[PDB]
């Protein structure tokens, strides 16, 4: 039987400072006991001073990030180049994830 | 007969141009934007004295920070208002924030040209959309059935529009207060209305950052009418 | 593309007339004469094989058509309209009856189905009425022999005997004088040939006349033996020779 | 009267006036031609330089279908593009199912049936283009021309647009003087000449020459644009003949 | 495109009338007269066949009176083919109701349903309306005996006595004159035939030019019987009432 | 007067669009003829290539619908090819569904039914063509069945179509009045083609070269068209007697 | 839900329905009314899968109320029961059937007779003098078979019903938290507040 | 006359009047100028107001980081067509990781507009567009007409009185094409070009709208005090 | 499907189909609505051209939408049934989803919305019907009376009339109805409603229908004799 999910490993870490924030992640990509890449970027600058990482199943993670980056682009078009606040991005990402409530993006996401 | 989406030899859509004529027959609605708020006022125009005038709802809330006045075939406005309210609250759902007045207006105007042979004809009503957001501040928009919307410092629509607009041309300046704008709407409404203006046949409203969108009581408007009469008699 | 004619092409005029139905009836009037006569032990339907060219093989063009083993049809008016109605009538006899009840429909109900199809062409969007009047002869166990006329409007009437098309007015008068309730099938065939001769100009023989009967069961035309209850079709088309034999005793 | 107001209506003549009015739009367009040669085909078109502001060699009119078919047309340019887009869908589905690239006669009928379909209903307008097209297949070279009615035939030489009569006359001479045939490189030269000679009907504005060709020997049976030295050589030959 | 040829069957006139409905009513006014009379102990349905022929097979013929179910019947005035479309729909509706509630359909509910179908053709779809007027004769245990009429507009009304088709103006005046509330079926039968005999465009009213039916509680004990009269039975009642 | 634009009845009970489709049939100014032999069915048609720029091999109004069925068309080529493609699709579908080759008369009926629909449905126009189907049917033998824009069709002993159809029709009528048989009593199809050409020459009063004619021949289990050289051989034999 | 009982006496129909509602291992409510008034003289009790019961009952209620307004007339208990049966028979072959069993107690004003109909989720209808759903009948039908007469008064019907509930309370493992009892007669529907 | 009731009807001379009437709407619209060099491409647009209380209708729309257009005619139709371009530019990026070629963007607009000119019920677009962009083959300028005709040009202008600006660019052709690596001078040439189409009114701070795209310059729009530099 | 735009703007900015729908209302029988202090009364004309009518079974002019709301109309009778059915379905749909009966204002807004939808939808014509919708909101003793019309506009009225000769009865109501002191009792409210119809009706026999709606779902229709007593008392006072 076809299993649409996989596990690409990795780990991510976000810490909020008083006037700054960090989002870290290892660059290793794996399947089972093999290494795919020793350097495969996992944390992305999505624009509007927002960084994002979707960790777990890389295919779903890349798709989510790609979709949110696209959501940012269309937010500018539709709302006169207004800056997408972090709280507004978070709520937007909730709806991106729940759109697949019955076939989930297999990722733990942090912005 | 002829297509509904047909161009005239002058390069205009017949139906859109004809809907504009219907809006000219509608009751007067005026909007004035200031740095203290935007005022919206309308002529109710009851067809009979037995008609309970307070049920005439030509000024309408879209969101806490956006209001709307209408003129023309007012029945057509109900679906536009419903769409506006839905768009405003849906954006709040998706983005956890208030929606920009311009973006709301653009969403309403996207419905306009969705007609053909979708709805069978354009809307026969014009809207004055007034509101406030953090980016562009206090704003007043005029949404037409053509799909076009202009921002205005002050605007009049309806039967006494060109006469009122000429009056708004002279009276409006960038340092107007909210109280001054209120009296100015009442003044111009009283000028273009057929019947004598009072608290029962004319309605005021405003939108401020603090209190949001508010329709004025008949008792509150009555005092502003009395305040107007005295200041006109003062010189 | 898409069929954008979703509106009726037949409508009431100020006088209450349905123009397209009337005009369809006018097309039927121009058509070649056909007739039907009901006897005590059978029904006969007949018409002229108006050949468009002598090079044309008129045998290949069948104006009298089998609808069921016990029901036959003939027309006056537009031939192509008739042909497609026969195709639909044959099919509806199976889909809306035989596949449900395991037997062929009675004459009146098959007529009712044909009538419905013709009515729908009078009201549905983007179509004209059928330009034919049908004469449907048939037999069934509980109603016996019957003859029905069906017009472009979808209206149908049962007849003892009648005629439609070119010389129908004269032909109906001729039938009124000759018809009675004690006619045998052979007498009805004889009267049919007499009536039809009046409307025909040129040659009058088995090769220019098409004639069929609804009568006794034909076990020789069944195609198989072994089932007692299956006794064969009552519809039979008369041959060219069989017609000519009856023209000598005319 | 009123028979010409709606497409797919037969006049009492038995004519479809809307299709005939579409031909008028074709006759109004710029001149385009096609020449069948020994082992292939050559296409050429007149591009009117409306203004100096037009970027030279950028507004390409000739279109490729698949990799072995060339299409050129005169009349309403968008209508031609719509027809080529369909042609590309037809060629793709043919190759998808049957593996081999679409033969030219097969391709010709695909366009023909599609154009003819737009004469069957009043809900659509006929095509405002005549299309000259062709290429090389397993059976050799083929040239076709397709009218607004859906009518098409095979051709030795073809021409359409405002300067079609002038072009046709020139094509007829080549057919008479070369019964054994014409080479691909010759056809390119002759194509240039004919467009230049046909330009006398559009002599107000100056023009830009555009040529393409499919040849078994010269292009391996693939459609290619005539560029650089070979184009200039054809322009020089054409300019020499008018003087 | 196609718009050119659209007659626009569902529009108002400047006066606020529906063109096609009015023209359909004009069609119906040329149809054979149908009369319905309601009595205390039953209902009568009488109708005139249009200029018949001697060669028409009458005993197997049905153009005016149709059975919807055991309790309800209709008289038709207009296009017979149109009427049969509606009749078959009404027959189905009655059976749907019986299957759902395990009770025979109340007369009005059936009438409203058919009238709603007619209404739809006047408001949407762009099709011509049904050129039919019905007289509904029926019985149920709520209102007892009931007469209704519907027309192409989809409007229906209840009646003690009513006519549709040709000469309704003359026929209604005659019914209004001789009708009384305490009237019985045998009297109503006589009134119906007498009214047709005076309003008819034919020279004389005969059995072969009539269809006749009664709905009686004249069935053995508390139940209702429908009687579609045969040609010989119409001939007998014509002699009995003293018309022929 | 919109009753003349679409296929609805006029007050006279006529369909003017159908009548005008018949007139479009003669727009090509080509005459066709069909006759039956003992073992074959022959169809001939005039071929006119007015433009010297045309490739004469592609100019044709005869179509190979199936292996057994051939079709000649009288009318404009776009409608002709429309009908040809549909007939090919129908002939192939028939064989797939019912397990045997579609008969000539059955295909004619099918195409005639499609044509009838265009006379009844408003959104579809009639095709301005007359279709003549020919074959050697496995049950009926040599067969000629002809369809027109009215949706009418019938079998023929022989037939002719075009502007000068009457002259050809009468010529054929007169021959069959003498011989008193429903076909050309001849063994080889070659001589049946010679008969067809000879009688078209006599009827029209024109001589033909190899490029002026177009010939289709139906035999048992195949229909085929003749080349220019095959026709030349036919014309030589005619001239030598 | 758990237990619903019904009994038809001389001049009325009495419906008794348990008050318990359980999610997981916790009894969330002990005063739940498992019934809906379909019309002034027709009451329907219900029991089955969580959520489906109320949704179905309210859907039936809406349809009958719609009928009442349209015709200005109350449908007979028999007519209502047939409508309900058809909806359940329609439901059982759906993608996701409504898992609901019902009792319909009504007083027919035309015939002046009480009527009790038992319908299960498959659409299985039966008219009965007394009825139950699920396991309720296993404990109670022996008592009803013994004590029931058709000429019983409403008070005698309640006493026999008390005996049935007492037997259930003794021999059932589940605590159903007593019952709400309602009486349907010529004057309409009323609830017995002390039971 | 009798042949202008819908887009599906040719006139006897082979004309499509509804398309020509749609073309007329562009001539009524306010003037906009487009021009390019080898490094940059520039749009200049004269915005129009309803009255003194009203704002000036926006003329320029961004489609991608490397592409955008200016409009003249029915503004809502420009919004539809620009939205379509935004989607097509975006489809190319998401699927092929490829910036959409300006020439291909023109081909897509042509085909979209064409479908509206051949079918019954619909209508032609009532707007003209000037598309600028910088892709792998350098700077580009396109002119879109709602007939479907799209044309690649060095420079052009559309709208009311556009012939004056078009003549100027036709003279200046050899000069402004050579303005490489100098955005301000290329804009100056565009502002000077659009000035040839002005009568009575002149270029004010809230009247003028400018956009630019180039080699190392994303598509950016300049309005308000940002264009006071060029007045 | 049939998509034809039947309701369209004309050069002068009018939708003729909607205006011609008002002409159908003008043709319809007169309907009147009067609200008292603690009640609303709906009066309706019955044209006496139709006798031999069965008044038991003939569709009544006033229709209950719910137990607390009623609807009368003027115009095409067949059209009114479609609005009434839709209104009744929405009333039950509201109770089912929100657990409260509709307010009179909500029900009016829905019916008005349906009428509006039929003025800008393809293939349909406007309803040739104007309605008077009256009742009392749940747990409220303030009377409610609304009017709708084909265009889809609606509004609240102290007293209103629609249909043929509505101009005359409105004239009567405008001078007779005092807002400061409305009909205090049921009698006064009915009397004023009958008086208003007597300006137009002709005979006061079976031509007048009256329906009184009181708070808490208390709706009753007056009989012929009850109405006839009002007709008698009015004219006897008039003879002076
Ligand atoms: Cl078929």
Swiss-Prot record, chain B:
The proteasome degrades poly-ubiquitinated proteins in the cytoplasm and in the nucleus. It is essential for the regulated turnover of proteins and for the removal of misfolded proteins. The proteasome is a multicatalytic proteinase complex that is characterized by its ability to cleave peptides with Arg, Phe, Tyr, Leu, and Glu adjacent to the leaving group at neutral or slightly basic pH. It has an ATP-dependent proteolytic activity. Keywords: Cytoplasm, Nucleus, Phosphoprotein, Proteasome. Present with 17100 molecules/cell in log phase SD medium. Its main location: cytoplasm. InterPro entries: Ntn_hydrolases_N, Proteasome_alpha, Proteasome_alpha-type, Proteasome_alpha_type_5, Proteasome_asu_N, Proteasome_sua/b. The lineage of its organism: Eukaryota, Fungi, Dikarya, Ascomycota, Saccharomycotina. Belongs to the peptidase T1A family. The 26S proteasome consists of a 20S proteasome core and two 19S regulatory subunits. The 20S proteasome core is composed of 28 subunits that are arranged in four stacked rings, resulting in a barrel-shaped structure. The two end rings are each formed by seven alpha subunits, and the two central rings are each formed by seven beta subunits. The catalytic chamber with the active sites is on the inside of the barrel. The gene is PUP2. It comes from Saccharomyces cerevisiae (strain ATCC 204508 / S288c). The modification Phosphothreonine is found at residue 47.
Curated annotation (Swiss-Prot), chain D:
It is found in: Cytoplasm; Nucleus. One of its GO terms (cellular component) is proteasome core complex, alpha-subunit complex. Keywords: Acetylation, Cytoplasm, Nucleus, Proteasome. The keyword Transmembrane helix does not apply. One of its GO terms (molecular function) is mRNA binding. Present with 12000 molecules/cell in log phase SD medium. This is Probable proteasome subunit alpha type-7. It comes from Saccharomyces cerevisiae (strain ATCC 204508 / S288c). The gene is PRE10. The chain holds residues 6 to 248 of 288 of the full protein.
From Swiss-Prot, chain F:
One of its GO terms (cellular component) is proteasome complex. GO terms for biological process: proteasomal ubiquitin-independent protein catabolic process; proteasome-mediated ubiquitin-dependent protein catabolic process. Keywords: Acetylation, Cytoplasm, Isopeptide bond, Nucleus, Phosphoprotein, Proteasome, Ubl conjugation. PROSITE patterns: PROTEASOME_ALPHA_1, PROTEASOME_ALPHA_2. It is found in: Cytoplasm; Nucleus. There is a cross-link at residue 222 (Glycyl lysine isopeptide (Lys-Gly) (interchain with G-Cter in ubiquitin)). The modification Phosphoserine is found at residue 227. The 26S proteasome consists of a 20S proteasome core and two 19S regulatory subunits. The 20S proteasome core is composed of 28 subunits that are arranged in four stacked rings, resulting in a barrel-shaped structure. The two end rings are each formed by seven alpha subunits, and the two central rings are each formed by seven beta subunits. The catalytic chamber with the active sites is on the inside of the barrel. Interacts with CIC1. The proteasome degrades poly-ubiquitinated proteins in the cytoplasm and in the nucleus. It is essential for the regulated turnover of proteins and for the removal of misfolded proteins. The proteasome is a multicatalytic proteinase complex that is characterized by its ability to cleave peptides with Arg, Phe, Tyr, Leu, and Glu adjacent to the leaving group at neutral or slightly basic pH. It has an ATP-dependent proteolytic activity. Belongs to the peptidase T1A family. This is Proteasome subunit alpha type-1. The gene is SCL1.
From Swiss-Prot, chain G:
It comes from the Eukaryota. The modification N-acetylmethionine is found at residue 1. Keywords: Acetylation, Cytoplasm, Nucleus, Phosphoprotein, Proteasome. One of its GO terms (molecular function) is endopeptidase activator activity. The modification Phosphoserine is found at residue 76. It is found in: Cytoplasm; Nucleus. GO terms for cellular component: cytosol; endoplasmic reticulum membrane; nucleus; proteasome complex; proteasome core complex, beta-subunit complex. Belongs to the peptidase T1B family. Present with 21800 molecules/cell in log phase SD medium. Non-catalytic component of the proteasome which degrades poly-ubiquitinated proteins in the cytoplasm and in the nucleus. It is essential for the regulated turnover of proteins and for the removal of misfolded proteins. The proteasome is a multicatalytic proteinase complex that is characterized by its ability to cleave peptides with Arg, Phe, Tyr, Leu, and Glu adjacent to the leaving group at neutral or slightly basic pH. It has an ATP-dependent proteolytic activity. This subunit has a chymotrypsin-like activity. This is Proteasome subunit beta type-4. It comes from Saccharomyces cerevisiae (strain ATCC 204508 / S288c). The lineage of its organism: Eukaryota, Fungi, Dikarya, Ascomycota, Saccharomycotina. The gene is PRE1.
């Amino acid at each position: 039987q076809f299993n649409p999910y996989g596990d690409n490993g990795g780990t991510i870490l976000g810490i909020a400072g008083e006037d700054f924030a960090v989002l870290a992640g290892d660059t290793r990509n794996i399947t089972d006991y093999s290494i795919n890449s020793r350097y495969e970027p996992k944390v992305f600058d999505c624009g509007d001073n927002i960084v994002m990482s979707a960790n777990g199943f890389a295919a779903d993670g890349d798709a989510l990030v790609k979709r949110f980056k696209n959501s940012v682009k269309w937010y500018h078009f539709d709302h006169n180049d207004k800056k997408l606040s972090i709280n507004s991005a978070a709520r937007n990402i909730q709806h991106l994830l729940y759109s697949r409530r019955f076939f989930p993006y297999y990722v733990y996401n942090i912005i | 007969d002829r297509g509904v989406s047909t161009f005239s030899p002058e390069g205009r859509l017949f139906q859109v141009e004809y809907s504009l004529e219907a809006i000219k027959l509608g009751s007067t609605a005026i909007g004035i934007a200031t740095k203290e708020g935007v005022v919206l006022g309308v002529e109710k125009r009851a067809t009979s004295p037995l008609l309970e005038s307070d049920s005439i709802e030509k000024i309408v809330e879209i969101d806490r920070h956006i209001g709307c006045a209408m003129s023309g075939l007012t029945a057509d406005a109900r679906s536009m208002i419903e769409h506006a309210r839905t768009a405003a609250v849906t954006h709040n759902l998706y983005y956890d924030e208030d929606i920009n007045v311009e973006s709301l207006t653009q969403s309403v105007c996207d419905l306009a040209l969705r007609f053909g042979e979708l709805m069978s004809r354009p809307f026969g009503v014009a809207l004055l959309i007034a509101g406030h957001d953090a980016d562009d501040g206090y704003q007043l928009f005029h949404a037409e059935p053509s799909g076009t919307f202009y921002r205005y410092n002050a605007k009049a629509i309806g039967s006494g529009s060109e006469g009122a607009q000429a009056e708004l041309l002279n009276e409006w300046h960038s340092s107007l207060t909210l109280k001054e704008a209120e009296l100015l709407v009442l003044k111009i409404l009283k000028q273009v209305m057929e019947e004598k203006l009072d608290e029962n046949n004319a309605q005021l409203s405003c939108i401020t950052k603090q209190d949001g969108f508010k329709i004025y009581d008949n008792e509150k408007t009555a005092e502003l009418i009395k305040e107007l009469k005295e200041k006109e008699a003062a010189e | 593309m898409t069929d954008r004619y979703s509106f009726s092409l037949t409508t009431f005029s100020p006088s209450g007339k349905l123009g397209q139905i009337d005009y369809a009836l006018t097309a039927v009037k121009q058509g070649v004469t056909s007739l039907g006569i009901k006897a005590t032990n059978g029904v006969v339907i007949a018409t002229e094989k108006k050949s468009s060219s002598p090079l044309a093989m008129s045998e290949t063009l069948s104006k009298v058509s089998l609808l069921t083993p016990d029901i036959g049809a003939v027309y006056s008016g537009m031939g192509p309209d008739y042909r497609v109605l026969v195709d639909k009538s044959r099919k509806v006899a199976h889909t809306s009856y035989k596949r449900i009840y395991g037997e062929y429909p009675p004459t009146k109900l098959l007529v009712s189905e044909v009538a419905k199809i013709m009515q729908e062409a009078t009201q549905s969007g983007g179509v004209r009425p059928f330009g034919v009047s049908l004469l449907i002869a048939g037999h069934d166990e509980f109603n016996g022999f019957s003859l029905y006329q069906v017009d472009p409007s979808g209206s149908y009437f049962p007849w003892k005997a009648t005629a439609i098309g070119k010389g129908s007015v004269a032909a109906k008068t001729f039938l009124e004088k000759r018809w009675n309730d004690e006619l045998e099938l052979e007498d009805a065939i004889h009267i049919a040939l007499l009536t039809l001769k009046e409307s025909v100009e040129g040659e009058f023989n088995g090769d220019t006349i098409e004639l069929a009967i609804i009568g006794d069961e034909n076990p020789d035309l069944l195609g198989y033996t072994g089932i007692p209850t299956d006794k064969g079709p009552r519809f039979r088309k008369l041959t060219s020779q069989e017609i000519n034999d009856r023209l000598e005793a005319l | 009267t009123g028979y010409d107001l709606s497409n797919s209506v037969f006049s009492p003549d038995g004519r479809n006036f809307q299709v005939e009015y579409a031909v008028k739009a074709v006759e109004n367009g710029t001149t385009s031609i096609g020449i069948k040669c020994n082992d292939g085909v050559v296409f050429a078109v007149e591009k009117l330089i409306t203004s100096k502001l037009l970027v030279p060699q950028k507004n390409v009119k000739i279109q490729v279908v698949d990799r072995h078919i060339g299409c050129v047309y005169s009349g309403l340019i968008p209508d031609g593009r719509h027809l080529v887009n369909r042609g590309r869908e037809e060629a793709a589905s043919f190759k998808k199912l049957y593996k081999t690239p679409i033969p030219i006669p097969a391709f010709a009928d695909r366009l023909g049936q599609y154009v003819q379909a737009h004469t069957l209903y009043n809900s659509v307008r006929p095509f405002g283009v005549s299309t000259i097209f062709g290429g090389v297949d397993k059976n050799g070279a083929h040239l076709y021309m397709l009218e607004p009615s859906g009518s098409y035939w095979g051709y030795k030489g073809a021409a359409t647009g405002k300067g079609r009569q002038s072009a046709k006359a020139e094509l007829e001479k080549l057919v008479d003087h070369h019964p054994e045939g014409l080479s691909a490189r010759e056809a390119v030269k002759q194509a240039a000449k004919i467009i230049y000679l046909a330009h006398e009907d559009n002599k107000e504005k100056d023009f830009e020459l555009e040529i393409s060709w499919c040849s078994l020997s010269e292009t391996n049976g693939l459609h290619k644009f005539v560029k650089g030295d070979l184009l200039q050589e054809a322009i020089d030959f054409a300019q020499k003949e008018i003087n | 495109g196609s718009r050119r040829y659209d007659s626009r069957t569902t529009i108002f006139s400047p006066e606020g009338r529906l063109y096609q409905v009015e023209y359909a009513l004009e069609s119906i006014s040329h149809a054979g007269t149908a009369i319905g009379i309601m009595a205390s102990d039953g209902i009568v349905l009488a109708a005139e066949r249009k200029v018949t022929s001697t060669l028409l097979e009458q005993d197997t013929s049905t153009e005016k009176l149709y059975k919807l179910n055991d309790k309800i019947a209709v008289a038709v005035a207009g296009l017979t083919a149109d009427a049969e479309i509606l009749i078959n729909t009404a027959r189905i509706h009655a059976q749907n109701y019986l299957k759902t509630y395990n009770e025979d359909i109340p007369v009005e509910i059936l009438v409203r349903r058919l009238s709603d179908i007619k209404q739809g053709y006047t408001q949407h779809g762009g099709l011509r309306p049904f050129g039919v007027s019905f007289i509904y004769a029926g019985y149920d245990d709520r209102y007892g005996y009931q007469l209704y009429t519907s027309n192409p507009s989809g409007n229906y009304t209840g009646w003690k006595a009513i006519s549709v088709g040709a000469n309704t103006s003359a026929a209604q005046t005659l019914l209004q004159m001789d009708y009384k509330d305490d009237m019985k079926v045998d009297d109503a039968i006589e009134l119906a035939l007498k009214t047709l005999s005076k309003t008819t465009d034919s020279s004389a009213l005969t059995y072969d030019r009539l269809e006749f039916a009664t709905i009686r509680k004249g069935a053995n004990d508390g139940e209702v019987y429908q009687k579609i009269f045969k040609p010989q039975e119409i001939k007998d009642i014509l002699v009995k009432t003293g018309i022929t | 007067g919109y009753d003349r634009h679409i296929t609805i009845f006029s007050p006279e009970g006529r369909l003017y669009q159908v009548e005008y489709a018949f007139k479009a049939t003669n727009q090509t100014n080509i005459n066709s003829l069909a006759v039956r032999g003992k073992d074959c069915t022959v169809v001939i048609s005039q071929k006119k290539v007015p433009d010297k720029l045309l490739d004469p091999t592609t100019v044709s109004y005869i179509f190979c619908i199936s292996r057994t069925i051939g079709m000649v068309v009288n009318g404009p080529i776009p409608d002709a090819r429309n009908a040809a493609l549909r007939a090919k699709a129908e002939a192939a579908e028939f064989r797939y569904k019912y397990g045997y080759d579609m008969p000539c008369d059955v295909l004619a009926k099918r195409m005639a039914n499609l044509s009838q629909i265009y006379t009844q449905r408003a959104y579809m126009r009639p095709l301005g063509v007359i279709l003549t189907f020919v074959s050697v049917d496995e049950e009926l033998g040599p067969s000629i069945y002809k369809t027109d824009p009215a949706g009418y069709y019938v079998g023929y002993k022989a037939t002719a179509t075009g502007p000068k159809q009457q002259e050809i029709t009468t010529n054929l009528e007169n021959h069959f009045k003498k011989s008193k048989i429903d076909h050309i009593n001849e063994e080889s199809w070659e001589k049946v083609v010679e008969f067809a050409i000879t009688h078209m020459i006599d009827a029209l009063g024109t001589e033909f070269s190899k490029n002026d004619l177009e010939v289709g021949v139906a035999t048992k289990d195949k229909f085929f068209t003749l080349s220019a050289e095959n026709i030349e051989e036919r014309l030589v034999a005619i001239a030598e007697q | 839900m758990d237990i619903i009982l019904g009994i038809r006496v001389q001049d009325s129909v009495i419906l008794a329905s348990s008050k318990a509602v359980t999610r997981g291992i916790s009894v969330l409510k002990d005063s739940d009314d498992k019934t809906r008034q379909l019309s002034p003289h027709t009451l329907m009790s219900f029991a089955g899968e969580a959520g489906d019961t109320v949704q179905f009952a309210e859907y039936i209620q809406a349809n009958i109320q719609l009928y009442s307004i349209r015709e200005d007339y109350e449908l007979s208990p028999q007519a209502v029961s047939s409508f309900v049966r058809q909806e359940l028979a329609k439901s059982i072959r759906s993608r996701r059937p409504y898992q609901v069993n019902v009792l319909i107690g009504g007083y027919d004003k035309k015939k002046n007779k009480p009527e009790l109909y038992q319908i299960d989720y498959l659409g299985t209808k039966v008219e009965l003098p007394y009825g139950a759903h699920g396991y309720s009948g296993f404990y109670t039908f022996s008592l009803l078979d013994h004590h029931y007469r058709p000429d019983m008064t409403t008070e005698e019907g309640l006493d026999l019903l008390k005996l049935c509930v007492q037997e259930l309370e003794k021999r059932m493992p589940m605590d159903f938290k007593g019952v709400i009892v309602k009486i349907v007669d010529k004057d309409g529907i009323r609830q017995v507040d002390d039971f | 006359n009798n042949y202008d009731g819908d887009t599906v009807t040719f006139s006897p001379t082979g004309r499509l009047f509804q398309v020509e009437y749609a073309l007329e709407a562009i001539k009524q619209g306010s003037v906009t100028v487009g021009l390019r060099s080898n490094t940059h491409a520039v749009l200049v647009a004269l915005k129009r107001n309803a009255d003194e209380l009203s704002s000036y209708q926006k003329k320029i729309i961004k489609c991608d980081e490397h592409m955008g257009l200016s409009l003249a005619g029915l503004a809502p139709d420009a919004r539809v067509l620009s939205n379509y371009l935004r989607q097509q530019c975006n489809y190319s990026s998401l699927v092929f990781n490829r910036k959409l070629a300006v020439e291909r963007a023109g081909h897509l607009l042509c085909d979209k507009a064409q479908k509206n000119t051949q079918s019954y019920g619909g209508r032609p677009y009532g707007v003209g567009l000037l598309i600028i962009g910088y892709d792998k083959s350098g700077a580009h300028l396109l002119e879109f007409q709602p007939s479907g005709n799209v044309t690649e040009l060095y420079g052009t202008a559309i709208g009311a009185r556009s012939q004056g600006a078009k003549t100027y660019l036709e003279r200046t052709l050899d000069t402004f094409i050579k303005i490489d690596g100098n955005p301000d001078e290329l804009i100056k040439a565009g502002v000077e070009a659009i000035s040839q189409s002005l009568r009575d009114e002149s270029l004010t701070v809230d009247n003028l709208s400018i956009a630019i795209v180039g080699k190392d310059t994303p598509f950016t729009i300049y309005d308000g005090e940002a264009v006071a530099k060029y007045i | 499907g049939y998509d034809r735009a039947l309701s369209i703007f004309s050069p002068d900015g009018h939708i003729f189909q909607v205006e011609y729908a008002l002409e159908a209302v003008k043709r319809g029988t007169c309907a009147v609505g009067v609200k008292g202090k603690n009640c609303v009364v709906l009066g309706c004309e019955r044209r006496s051209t139709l006798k031999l009518q069965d008044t038991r079974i003939t569709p009544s002019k006033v229709s209950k939408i719910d137990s607390h709301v009623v609807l009368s109309f003027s115009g095409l009778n067949a059209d009114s049934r479609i609005l009434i059915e839709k209104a009744r379905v929405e009333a039950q749909s509201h109770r089912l989803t929100l657990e409260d009966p509709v307010t009179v204002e909500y029900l009016t807004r829905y019916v008005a919305g349906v009428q509006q939808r039929y003025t800008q939808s393809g293939g349909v014509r406007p309803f040739g019907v104007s309605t008077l919708i009256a009742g009392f909101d749940p747990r409220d003793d303030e009377p409610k009376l609304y009017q709708t019309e084909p265009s889809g506009i609606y509004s609240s009225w102290s007293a209103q009339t629609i249909g043929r000769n509505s101009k005359t009865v409105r004239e009567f109501l405008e001078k007779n109805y005092d807002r400061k002191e409305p009909p205090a009792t049921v009698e006064e409210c009915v009397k004023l409603t009958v008086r208003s119809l007597l300006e137009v009706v002709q005979t006061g026999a079976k031509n007048i229908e009256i329906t009184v709606v009181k708070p808490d779902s208390d709706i009753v229709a007056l009989s012929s004799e009850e109405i006839n007593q009002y007709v008698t008392q009015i004219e006897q006072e008039k003879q002076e």
